DNA sequence: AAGACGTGGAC
DNA sequence: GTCCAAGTCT
């Protein structure tokens with residue numbers, strides 16, 4: 001970027017950003033902990049989604065030390081519905097590491113900060129530049145799109161050769177006077193003007209520096225690979241109540257998909273032997289007798305890498321003794337306390353409507 | 356590496 | 367209905 005007017009670019013970009021900067025709860029100060037929380041929440045989650053989640057999370061957990069001293073089940077419930085739940089398990093372990101090894105002080109050296117769980121190349125850049133003014137690039141989806149258009153990068157943005165190149169661009173053009181504002185400005189440009197479809201080049205403050213605008217190839221950039229079809233997984237789900245009114249739920253294991261979350265009992269059903277497969281599964285628990293009615297709904301629930309096809313079977317349960325872990329009976333009132341994945345919150349809504 | 360890992364805003 | 371978001375794990 002020898003022929004690039006970095007200083008002219010920075011002036012127009014930072015002048016735009018001051019005018020159009022959105023009022024977001026994590027922009028009210030530069031507390032390293034609060035910045036870190038917002039940036040983790042923001043990973044692969046849109047700003048408008050994150051806003052109410054951040055507001056409530058910081059209410060329950062106002063300080064790094066409050067999050068460290070808290071129980072993992074309360075931490076998980078405060079993320080309920082946001083998706084990619086290991087972010088919060090990672091964040092929770094990381095803040096414990098900071099309380100121990102670092103005296104509660106978020107490290108300001110990138111190598112030490114990046115070593116914390118949950119902190120990748122994007123989050124090192126975003127937290128350190130905002131909270132401490134470290135000139136580290138914060139290259140997210142927004143930035144990759146903007147830079148591939150400004151500088152006509154035609155290579156798949158998923159390659160490391162391309163990532164290293166975006167990083168090297170940011171180090172050349174960044175305003176080392178205010179690296180936090182520079183990083184948040186490039187992102188904000190990608191979010192509000194230089195958008196994935198139909199970018200607003202005519203309202204763009206840096207139109208005169210953009211190579212894709214000049215060549216008329218903006219909407220063809222960035223280069224990303226089309227998504228390949230994902231496996232469909234049939235799943236039978238039982239909503240079982242008893243004479244007293246309590247419902248049978250169970251806690252998922254701590255490894256893999258939707259870990260440590262609660263669900264209604266379920267099982268894979270290649271074919272349509274779900275009424276049978278469920279009865280065989282519930283009865284295999286100690287002193288548990290069960291009889292299920294016909295299904296009441298079937299809906300899909302999408303994950304990034306697979307798609308669940310849920311069928312809900314109501315039923316009733318008789319227990320001759322204590323229900324063995326991982327299972328548990330819960331009155332309908334106590335359900336709102338447990339953390340459920342979105343799929344199973346909908347299972348429950350469809351069962352209450354049916355009744 | 357590759358693939359696992361959630362959900363919904365914004366068209 | 368489709369894309370992709372203020373990505374990271376190891």
Ligand code: SF4
Nearest residue numbers: 194201204207210218
């Ligand atoms: S002129 Fe258009 S393509 Fe170029 S940076 Fe601005 S919005 Fe993006």
Ligand SMILES: [Ca+2]
Nearest residue numbers: 114115119120
């Ligand atoms: Ca790291």
Ligand SMILES: [Ca+2]
Nearest residue numbers: 253254255256
């Ligand atoms: Ca498991």
